[model samples]
Structure formats: structure tokens, C-alpha cells
Target chain A: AQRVALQLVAIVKLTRTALLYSDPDLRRALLQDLESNEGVRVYPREKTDKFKLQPDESVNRLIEHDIRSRLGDDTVIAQSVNDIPGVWISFKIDDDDYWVAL
Target chain B: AQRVALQLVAIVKLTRTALLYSDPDLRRALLQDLESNEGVRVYPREKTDKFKLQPDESVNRLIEHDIRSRLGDDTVIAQSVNDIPGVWISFKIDDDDYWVAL
Candidate 1:
């Protein structure tokens, strides 16, 4: 169960990264790829101003909410790297740590 | 400095995940691709017993060690999700939490 949840999170994390880091057209292409795949579903993309970047906290909170809704509230969705160097967001199951950069 | 470190860690995390989740031929191909890249270098892959998966703690500790050595000791290397569901590993900087699954 733990491994399965982590794998799902990994997929979600990869999808999020693709959306954030890829070019606009590339992002749309990736989304289309997921949409066409029977094994995966694309999440709704949020709109934002061109000049203003979306807040990481808001995005992460949304990710957490979605993941918890699907995986359950017991899912360890906690904050970390407060006032520290090399900070990031994390999800854990058993001893495995699935990491995503902020 | 923070963003740079986080980006580096993200690269490392992605590389690690590819190694763990990909098939042998694909993993080797990915490694070769990295080796040929002018911007990124591949890390040495560790060997393990065929039947015994490597412990997450040991692997995370190694990743932490390498990241700290390159980034600095002030790097936030910490264990998390003790006695919790959806347990994972994480790093943080400022308010951004970087996550990894064990």
C-alpha cells in the first residue's frame, strides 16, 4: 500500500514539474499525453497573470489537498525546511522519501 | 544560492528516481544520455543484492551526504514522518519543502 501511494505521488510530482518547468506549448502537449493515456488523468490547470508567478505555498497546499483526498488524511503532508538552507517539499511513506523542489 | 541548491537537488532526486523505477536497459540509456550532456554529470550507481532492496535510510543518508558536501553542512538534512502514514523523506529551504519517497 505504501509503495503504491508513493508511486502515485511520484507521478503527480512529475506532472507538476512538467507543468512548472516546461515551455507553454510543451506543457500543453504533456497534458494532452496524460489526458490520452488510460492509466492517468490530467489535473485542472490554474490560471495566473503573466507577470505574477503563482505562490509555491498555494500550489503545494493544493497538491497536498488533492493527494490527501485520494490517498487519505493520514497521508503525511507536512511542511519542512523552515529557515534552513537547500529547502524543499516532501512526502513520505514507510521509510521512503519522495522529494520535490520548491 | 538557495534556488541554485534546490535546483541541483531536484536534478539529483530525478536521477535517483529514474534509476530506481526504470528498467535496466532504459536506466543505462538514461545514464549514457546524462554522461553525454554538457550541462549535467551522472552519479555512480550503487550495487545491491538481487533479493534485498537497499534500505531507504542508508540511501537517503548518502544522498544527504553528497548534497551537503556539494552545497554545505548548513544544508537542512533531517529525518521525518516517524510513526505516520504516507511517510517520506524531505529537504527544505526558506518555506519551500523538497520531498522524496523512501
Candidate 2:
């Protein structure tokens, strides 16, 4: 449990670091690196109408598409306490569930 | 003039990226890299009394000391719109001046 907690903290730190970059490509690369872990996944706060998930499209595919398109926008960055607009990360360890907002 | 404006934008981007890292050392390294240029300098919002500048200690020296000690605290991370705790970057180009709060 302690080890999992520490990894979660590292994940938060990395997410924050990725946001510091304003370039969309760089942000996408960092997020991709993070989500590459089998247990980790990232999701945007709100789904965009432009890219509605098809009956056959997976949630992961939608998320990747959105990230590639919108990650660097001001609407997506956590600009203020009143406005924390970023991705949510969810992961699992054994039977336990964990989540973090970045 | 256009060239200078672009550089300023790039600087802002880099500073934002540096803040994403929670580790003090990484943040310090990025800020140091930014400040290494002759025209760029970084400052904290409030001077801590523990490290008061002596008559002989320049403001620049004081800022460097503070960055080494305090860049990663929540008080310096721009956590909210109401609480943007971070450093100020100032620069000059051909007599015209500019400043940015990160």
C-alpha cells in the first residue's frame, strides 16, 4: 500500500511537470509516456462534441484523440483554483482503486 | 521587436513547464537555465526575513539564494487563481523592459 501511494505521488508530479510545457506535441508525448503503463489511464474532464465516441470506438481511443487535439489549450490547463482544467488519472493495484486529478 | 516578443513567449512557456515538476532540484535547474541568459532574471513575490540581504549582497544574489531554498513550496507553485504562488521573471531588450509572473 505504501509503495502504491508513492507511485501515485510520482504520477501526480509527472503530470504537473508535463503541464508546464505549453506545446501540444510535448504535452502529448509526456502524457503518452505516462499512460503507457498498463494500470494507468488519462481522461479529459468533459467530452467534446466534435469527437463523439463511435459505437465501435473505445474510450481510450477517444481520450488519445482529445489529448492530441486539445491538451495545450488554456481551457485544458489548471490556471487557477477556480479553474483546474486538466486530465484525470485512474489506476488500479490489486483490488484497490485510485484516482488523481492533474 | 517581433523577435523579442517571440522570445518572451517562449520564456513563459518554459517557466510554466518548469513549475510542473514538484522536485525542487528540477525546478531550480530549469529556472537557472532561464536565468543564465544575460538579460533574464527571476524573483520571488516576498522576501523571507531569514535571508535578509546585507548591504554588500546584491538583489540578484538574494534571489538566487531564495530560489535555492524555496522554489518548490506550495507558497511558490501558483496553486490557485486566488493563490498564485510563484516567481517573477524580468528581462530587458534594447532599453524596452518586460516582466512576467509565473
Candidate 3:
């Protein structure tokens, strides 16, 4: 059986509702939410509004950088999924702007 | 930015004889046949007679309802993709037996 590897970064809104809760704890909560509920553990997270404009691309770059940094250039890039709403690339990994929620 | 949204759907049916017609437009012509030649657009269809018995619920409800609702109350159930031929449940919607082609 093939081992499944998934990388996800939630883009929390920083609006009034967001501000209603504490930031650090909320971030941790998001991580715990995925880990406990979705069976996906947090690998890494960075806070930036840079993902605000081009969220899909930004997330893709972030994951790619993470993979490259962690696994080194020798590792083959298999696939990546980004959870930004509205944008959908083909289901194929190398295809542009493709992501699907598991 | 956040200027896009999508919730997509599609479905079609093919019969036993017309199996090798991979031309995209040929499937599209099936749609016109549905209007004039046949009756309705045949998008691109998969000849799933197993989906035929309880056809109304085969694809639509299978797609919409979470695995829990599809299986109901049993630990947020999930459906595995296993191909088989069989007959099954036909749910009612708005007093009509409508099934989403997607």
C-alpha cells in the first residue's frame, strides 16, 4: 500500500469574528482540529497575509518550499493539495491550481 | 483574491454499443440527440446499469450526502470506491425522482 502524505494550511480570517478569539491559541486550535478530527497532523504553519491575494499559488509555493527544504532536491514531487476556496486545478498533481479536500 | 467560487456538477449516460467514441463532441452530440435525435443532452455517460435500479439515488445522493447520511448514524461512515453491478435504494426529492447527472 502507498503511504498517503498531505499538507494543508488553513487561512484563518482576521476579521471581527477572528479577532473574537485569541490568536496563538486559535492557531494551535486549528492545528489540533486537523490533527484530531481529520487525521492529518500539522507539519508546519507560517502566518502571512501574503497568501491573501494569490492564496492558491501562495500555498502551493509554501508547500513546495517545505517539501524541497525537508526532503531535499533528490526527492520527487508527487502531488500537493491546497484548500483555498474557489480555485480548483485538475486532480493531477503537476496540473496548475488543482486541489481537492479529502 | 477571493473573487471566485465554484460548486460544480455533471453526469451522463452511455449505452452498450457506443463504447469507443472518445471524441468529446460525440458525447456532446448525444445531448442534441436528447433534444432532437434522442431527447436530452447525454453529456458523457457511463453505462452503469447497477446505477439503473435505484438510479435516482445512485450518483446524486451519493455525491451530496456525506458518507454518514448515505450510510446513516454509523460513525460518520465513508464509502469506498469499489466497482460492482447491483440494484439498490431510490430516495425521493421534492416528490420527483430526479438525479443529478454530476
- Whole-model Cα lDDT of every candidate shown, in order: 0.41, 0.37, 0.27
| Per-candidate TM-score against the hidden true structure | 0.26, 0.23, 0.22
Chain A TM-score of model 1 comes to 0.39
lDDT of 2 at B39: 26
Model 2 CAPRI quality: incorrect
Candidate No. with top DockQ: 2
lDDT of 1 by residue, B13-54 (tens): 543333333444455565554434312334332222012222
What DockQ results for candidate 2? 0.05
lDDT tens per residue, model 2, A1-71: 33333333344433443444324445555455445522233444333212222233335444434443432
Worst 10 residues of 1 chain A by lDDT: A45-54
lDDT of 1 by residue, A6-102 (tens): 4445454543433333444455555554444312334332122011222465355566566666655654443333333222334443444443322
Error of 2 at B90 (Å): 34
CA deviation > 4 Å runs, candidate 2:
A37-39, A47-102, B1-102
DockQ scores of the candidates:
0.02, 0.05, 0.02
**lDDT computed for candidate 3:** 0.27
**RMSD in order of candidates:** 18.1, 17.6, 17.6
Looking at model 1, give its docking quality level.
incorrect
- Predicted structure with the largest TM-score when compared to the true one: 1
State each model's TM-score restricted to chain B: 0.39, 0.32, 0.21
